[PDB]
Structure formats: structure tokens, C-alpha cells
Symmetry: D2
Subunit: 106 residues, 4 copies
């Protein structure tokens, strides 16, 4: 899918985690977010279209998706192990990674 379709998946599933009742709901939404981050990684965003593929800006853009996937790995351990409130708080902290990339490149 294209970059804007993957951003709608990340935004919709963050809202599902905030309102979730149980572990199965939080694990399914975190899994869908990790798949959307892995697919977004191959895109070139509109503000970087004139840059080279190997530019420092394109390295920094791709790096943000590696960081988001490592944060989701840790939150999945909490959601699978009777720490669902701690996993919901971890998902709130993902917003710092979303906002950093938007401020530079959106």
C-alpha cells in the first residue's frame, strides 16, 4: 500500500488501543501497526521527492520506522503477560516518534 494508506492504519489502531477492554484487542492492533510501519519504510515522502535515495534525510526518514517497530516489540511483551494497562501507556509514548517525523518531513 502507499504511504497515506499505511498512516491511516497507524492512526486508526492507536485509537483502538486507547479504548480497548482486553489483551486480544491490544495485541491485534499492535500487530497491524507493526505491519503498516514495515510497508511504509519503502516510500519516498512528497517533501523529499527531489532528494537522492542515499541522502542523510532519506536515512533519517527510514530510521523512524525501525524505531517504531522496536517500541511495538516491547509493548507486545507487556500486552501478552497480564500488563495490559502498562501496554496502553507504552502506546501513548509512540506519539513522540510520530510527532518527531511529522515536524521534519510532513
Amino acid at each position: 500500500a502507499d504511504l497515506e494508506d499505511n498512516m491511516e492504519t497507524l492512526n486508526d489502531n492507536l485509537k483502538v488501543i486507547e479504548k480497548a477492554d482486553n489483551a486480544a484487542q491490544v495485541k491485534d492492533a499492535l500487530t497491524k501497526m507493526a505491519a503498516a510501519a514495515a510497508d511504509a519504510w519503502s516510500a519516498t515522502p512528497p517533501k523529499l521527492e527531489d532528494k537522492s535515495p542515499d541522502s542523510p534525510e532519506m536515512h533519517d526518514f527510514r530510521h523512524g520506522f525501525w524505531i517504531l517497530i522496536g517500541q511495538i516489540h516491547d509493548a507486545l511483551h507487556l500486552a501478552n503477560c497480564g500488563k495490559v494497562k502498562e501496554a496502553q501507556a507504552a502506546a501513548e509514548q509512540l506519539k513522540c516518534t510520530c510527532n518527531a517525523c511529522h515536524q521534519k518531513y510532513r
Copy 2:
């Protein structure tokens, strides 16, 4: 994009890194390995076909691909930084993770 094809991609690229001429060749092989691990994670392997998706065996099988992806993230920092011999030594340490999964599930 079946499990056997993803395994071929992992094995061929590990060999490219061992014999590489420069940093560009190491970075391109490590990136192909990470794409194949993200694709392999969705498979149910032949020996676990009779188990639940929520079984402790299927959680441990999926977990090995998350561990491989985090090891590749660190090796990519070394390869991009003028630390090419260090990145080739890190790629040889991935074999620990490959062998642990094979002894249990292949």
C-alpha cells in the same frame, strides 16, 4: 513469498556479507535479510500446523523473527559508520538465532 523462499533469501545474503568488497554491498545484503524476516513471520511452519495460533510454541516461533530484525538494525548502524569488519562479525553472530529456531521447529 512463502517460508521456504524467505529462507533461501536469508541464506544467500548471509554468504554475500561474508565475501563483500565494501560497505555498500554489506548494507544492501542486510536490508534484503530484514525484508525476508518480516515476510517469514506470517507463516505457520509444517511442525506447528496442528497447534493453536495463541499457543506458547507459535509465540516462541514468531518471536525469533523480531529478535533477528533487532540484530540487523544494530549491524546496519555499524555498516553505515565505517565499521565494516565489525558489521561482518555481527552478521556471523546472527547464526546463533538461526540455529536456535531450527533445533526446535525445523
Copy 3:
């Protein structure tokens, strides 16, 4: 050695990184922050003096220092590899981890 002294070291070194001109200055400040977080990990804060060491609250308090030290490991690769602006932006993103612990336990 006390928790308040370690917190002053973390805050002072964030300010040094924001004002830095070169890689050596950023790497030195990040290293001092990692040593202060590793010393704070064994402390008990005033609001948790009544709790078991194996309570969920004490597990979550110690977890925040494990997360902070992993974020400093990633920023140190950027600082060593000449990516000074990218290491400064990573240090600004640490504030998310500081703010989350303080809202729960300060």
C-alpha cells in the same frame, strides 16, 4: 549518589547536548547520562517506599531506566558516526520517557 543528584545530572547533560557544536561533546554528555540512569535504577522513590520490591509498581519504575538506556545506546551510534544533528534530535525525544515516569511516580 542519591536519586535527586542523578536527576540533576540527567537534566544538565540534556542542556549541554542542545548547545553542542561537535560530536565529541555530544558523546561525552550521552555517556554521563547512561552512568546516572544505571545508578538511579537501584533507588526507591518516596511514593513507593511502602511497596514490595517485586510489586507491579516497582517493576514498572525499574523498566523506565531499561527503556532510557536503550534509547541512549541508539543515540551513541549516531554521535560516533558524525550524525550530530540527528543525535541532538534523538536526545530531545528522550524527554517523552522522562515525562512518563514523572507523571506516574514523582
Copy 4:
């Protein structure tokens, strides 16, 4: 707190994990290993005494302790989650990190 004393602590606690009966014994041993690896990071090993503290070899030596502590972080999630057999298998995989540093620098 010398390098040889920290190494004895790492070796004794690794052996505890292999034949442990319960989660509490595996959590206590992993925590003792993380504190010994953090204290070892400040030492200069006899074979690197004539190198600069900023040499590529001293950066690689320090990096091995950062890698070991990230591996202990993930194994502590499994030991706290009722996944004691999975934590014992993760501890077997630490051996690849111990053996890679010894082959270079011991």
C-alpha cells in the same frame, strides 16, 4: 569490582539459570548478570592496555557489554511472564556474545 571478579559473577549466574526450578531463581540470576556487565564496561583488558581509550578496539570491547545488557532485558520479560523454559533458551544464546568477545580480546 575488578574485571576478573565481574567475569566470575557472570559465569556463576549463567550456570544457575541452566538448571533452575522456578521464575524467582532465574530473575535473581539475570539481574546479578546485568549489574556485573555494567561494572565490567569501565575496565581495560590486559590485551588492549597499549591502545588508546578512543581506538576502534576499545569501542568494540565496550559495545559487547551494551549488546549483553539488551539480551538480558528481553530474557527478563520472558522470566516475569511465566515463560521460564523460553528464558532458559535465551540464556543459552547469551553464550554467543561471551564467546565472540573472548575470541578477540581474552
